[PDB]
Paper text:
Receptor-triggered and heat-triggered 135S structures (designated "r135" and "h135", respectively) were solved at 3.2 Å resolution (after density-based masking and sharpening). As expected, the capsids of both r135 and h135 were expanded by 4%, with holes at the 2-fold axes, were full of RNA, and failed to show well-ordered native-like VP4 pentamers lying flat on the inner surface of the capsid. The r135 and h135 structures were qualitatively similar. Surprisingly, both r135 and h135 maps lacked a visible extension of the VP1 N-terminus through the quasi-3-fold hole, which was supposed to be the structural hallmark of these particles. In both cases, residue 69 was the first ordered residue of VP1; residues 43–53 of the bottom loop of VP2 (which supports the VP1 N-terminus) were disordered; and the quasi-3-fold hole was partially blocked by the GH loop of VP3. As in native virus, the center of the cup (near the 5-fold axis) contacts the VP3 beta tube; but further from the 5-fold axis, unlike native virus, the density is seen to curve away from the capsid (as if it were peeling off of the inner surface of the capsid).
Poliovirus is a small (~30nm) non-enveloped, positive sense, single-stranded RNA virus. The icosahedral capsid of the virus, which is made of four proteins, namely VP1, VP2, VP3, and VP4, encloses the viral genome. For enteroviruses such as poliovirus, genome delivery involves a program of conformational changes that include expansion of the particle and externalization of two normally internal peptides, VP4 and the VP1 N-terminus, which then insert into the cell membrane, triggering endocytosis and the creation of pores that facilitate the transfer of the viral RNA genome across the endosomal membrane. Structurally, receptor binding results in an icosahedral expansion of the capsid by 4%, yielding a 135S, or A- particle.
Numbering used by the authors:
A (entry chain 2), B (entry chain 2), C (entry chain 2): 13 to 43, 52 to 134, 143 to 159, 174 to 264
D (entry chain 1), E (entry chain 1): 69 to 213, 234 to 281
F (entry chain 3): 61 to 231
The structure:
Amino acid sequence: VLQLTLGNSTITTQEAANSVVAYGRWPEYLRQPTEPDVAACRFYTLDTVSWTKESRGWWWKLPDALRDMGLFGQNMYYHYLGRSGYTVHVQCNASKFHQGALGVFAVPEMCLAGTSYQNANPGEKGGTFTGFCPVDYLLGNGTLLGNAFVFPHQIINLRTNNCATLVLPYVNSLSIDSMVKHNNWGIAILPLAPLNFASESSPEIPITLTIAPMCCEFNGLR
Amino acid sequence: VLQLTLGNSTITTQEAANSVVAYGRWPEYLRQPTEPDVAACRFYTLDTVSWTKESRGWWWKLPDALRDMGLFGQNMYYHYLGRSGYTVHVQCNASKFHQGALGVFAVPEMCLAGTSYQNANPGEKGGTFTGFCPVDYLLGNGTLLGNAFVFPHQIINLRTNNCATLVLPYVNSLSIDSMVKHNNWGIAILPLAPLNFASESSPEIPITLTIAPMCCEFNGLR
Amino acid sequence: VLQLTLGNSTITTQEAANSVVAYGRWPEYLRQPTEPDVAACRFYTLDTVSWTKESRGWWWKLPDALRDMGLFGQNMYYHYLGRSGYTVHVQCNASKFHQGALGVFAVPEMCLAGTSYQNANPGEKGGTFTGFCPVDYLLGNGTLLGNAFVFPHQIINLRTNNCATLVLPYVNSLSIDSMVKHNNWGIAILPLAPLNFASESSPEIPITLTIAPMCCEFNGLR
Amino acid sequence: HRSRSESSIESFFARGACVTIMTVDNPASTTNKDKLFAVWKITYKDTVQLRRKLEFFTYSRFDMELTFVVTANFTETNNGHALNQVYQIMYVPPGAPVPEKWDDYTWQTSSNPSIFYTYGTAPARISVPYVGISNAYSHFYDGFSLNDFGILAVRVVNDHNPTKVTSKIRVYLKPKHIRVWCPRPPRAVAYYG
Amino acid sequence: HRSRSESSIESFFARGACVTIMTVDNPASTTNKDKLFAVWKITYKDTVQLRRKLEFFTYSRFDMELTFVVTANFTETNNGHALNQVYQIMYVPPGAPVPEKWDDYTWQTSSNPSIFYTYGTAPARISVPYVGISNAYSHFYDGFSLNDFGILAVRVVNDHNPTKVTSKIRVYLKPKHIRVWCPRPPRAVAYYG
Amino acid sequence: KKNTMEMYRVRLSDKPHTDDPILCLSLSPASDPRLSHTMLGEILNYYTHWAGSLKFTFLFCGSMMATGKLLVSYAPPGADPPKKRKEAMLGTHVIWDIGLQSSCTMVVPWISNTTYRQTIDDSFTEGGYISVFYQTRIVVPLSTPREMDILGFVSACNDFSVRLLRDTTHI
């Protein structure tokens, strides 16, 4: 049990073994803007989601998720430009008698499709796929989902590991950019193997996202 | 699995990690009497007690518990004065699906109250608290039970550890004393969190006390 | 012409010659809390006041003045305790043909009197003495005003120097304290010699306060 | 500067000064009201000399060497005789509960130090130290929710007395080891009464 | 841990605390009953503050610095005069026989230490040491056949007095050099009266 | 529940999952009636002033199979307590995974303007607010009782100290 800390936040990880760095590049500051690594770099734990049998998937955009989230959300409104890597812990705590799997896919430029800002930007609650709501096995764009495993990703197979970790570097055409407008990353959690459980066990296991913005740096503060 | 031995007795401990020494003083001989450490210093395992949902607590006095217990009980009648430390293993073996907690409190001079010798001295069977029978959350004397955790104590929380160990030194105003009259120590086991279990599991888990009198020494034999 | 700077602020001082440090103690950090010297330590220039012939005086409390003032005002609400020294530049820019004088008195614990919070705390606009409104030559408490020159103070005599500077250390019974409740310092500007000017000159010269909170440090952020 | 000592802060403040006259009665069973005991919260804000001197300055620390001068007298001409009385002079520290009856629980409480002064002996005396929660007594405090020095309670310990005996206790506060901070314009003698 | 002293066991317990008020009478030949002398077995189990403090812990040792505050008064208005009385304050140690009459043999016995306190002087005082048979006072003892500290007896020595003079003696026990052992849940204030 | 065994256990069911916390404990250690009766509170009823830190400990006394997350928040002085999980999370907090660690310690720190604090303040709640929310509703396997209990402990830290004794015990 590894107990991680970032300032006024603390997390209880099993242990950071099955941790995927996206594209083998650790988040780095730009090799010019300010770096509020003081307290904006902490664990923001979103509101948990319930994975029932019927669930098709969930998705969040980054940093649109962390838009109402305290200092990062503040920084990201009162500055004009910013860039941030992330550490997404997807913990999915279930008993030994639940079974299933989750594909956790970090997606660069995750343009979804069933269009408008409020619609493409659900914030902290996230959105959900469906068989608007994009198609689950497409991620909106008419994709075959198996191919999705090109994306930086990790499986949460309940028999084995019950949590994934994705370390995302800043991916963008530009060196820095407006965060209020343009979501670099996109997280989609789809249940590969559906949930099932023993007769009168907990019929909906929870899933929790913990997002530490790594190496964030912003410019210019209004 | 640590298999402990004392002469003609043997015990199967999980391992002696969560072992509380009362008041940080290990039992010692007096720094003048005889020391029957030959065979009186062995494991005396009392008659198990069944912890149902409705149980409020149990208690034993020491050495009144070990009064009919073989050589120690003999020594402690035919000598006039004695002193003895103890090692109380409270093993409480339950499945992974039972839940609850036990506070095991070693109490110096555990004068209980609802008065007479046979009444204040239950022997090997012990007594039981009740909501005579003393009040559970008082230990007879009008105490708030949380405060009880000043006493040398240990929790047996069924999710984690299922057994406690208390190493008690000889606590008394005197250097040596009559054991037939005056019980130095007192053990009270109260269920902090009540027992509960899955639907058709074992509805009453057992609790077993194993009492090794350490560093006993007596005077004068009639 | 000395051009002073603090981050995103800049000031045009004549030159820092006639600069009074109150009680000969420069502001110091406590020899435990955080020190937001990043951007809260800047020049906050209050809304200018017009000194006509009929003016009797003005006053501000510190840090109640800087309560709606950006980061310092933020820090000073979301933290529970704080302490701050100050640098008060009172610039009073008039022509060569206006005449008069101003006594600028930094006052520890400037309890005024003609009582309630909103009344004793004017904020950024400040209050004004009168011949509620306290008595000018008393500073509310029944004082003879000449004696006021015991306070850390400076004269702005328009013939000579047209600006004062007061460097105030943190004065309080406590090492740190709640700023939302209790105003350590108090600034009172009273016209010693009344304004007068040549026939058709500017009939009301302005007075401007610039307050740099020095060595501020706060605890604990909610 | 010929030995400026006499105007040093110690020489200035540290002087015996009567701060109150506390009157108590003998527990006669006739019609004695709740004057059986006297209570007084230690405060300079009633005596003008010490107040005016302290209010030269903003903050201060000082020990406090209270001295008690008890003087009694028979009330009516039924004097006859009456045995030498004893007075309990309890110093209730700050934040502690003050007595309410002659024989409240507070008088026996271990916390509250107490003198048992016999009449016709040398004046009693304690030395309260600095009892401030702050690091200095604030005489002026611009802020929102005065400082506590304590209470002095005084009673006659004797019980079944046939003759009434009034008694006044002069408290002579002498602030000791004074330090002060941040001088101020002295308030005028005018506005204290 | 800024000078934790104030909560040290000495600072905690060692405080003057009135444990009893013993009332005696003058040997007037009128109708004076056996109130001519007062007797009191030293025991904390009546005063609640000290009891509750001691019963935090299981065992203890402490010397005992008793102090006596005597205060008298004429009973009836026939005061007139009466000469300064003297009080015999006998401390009967443990296991010794306690007085039964005003002039029992015990009052003259060499063993029993005794104070001869003159009225209107400074309060009397002795320091009983640790008088335990055990190596520590047991406040709770699970066993079969309470500890002894002694008895205090008090009388007026004067004999042929015309006027009655009641007198109360406040005993101010201050336990000194306390050591304690084996903390316990503190009993509640509820069950002491 | 009071003056029984039940007054120490906080029950965690899987009933309608509301955002209001499992518990919110104000740290006015002598003034708060809950912490008033602990041994800490007992010793603090004997003293006018105190200072220092307080370690709290929450102990899960449920099934070995149960899993979930409790968020243990600490609002500092002046801050009104959190009402929702998000507000609490944004402040200081500890996410506590029942499955992994069965206990959770938290050392509330020392914060005061004065060097000490009175134990009978001006009837003014300040300082602590130790709240505990559900981050995730508790997961249990087969027919395992969905009603668990958690216990809460408290102790002065090493730095803690008191001063100016004040006996008040009386009848």
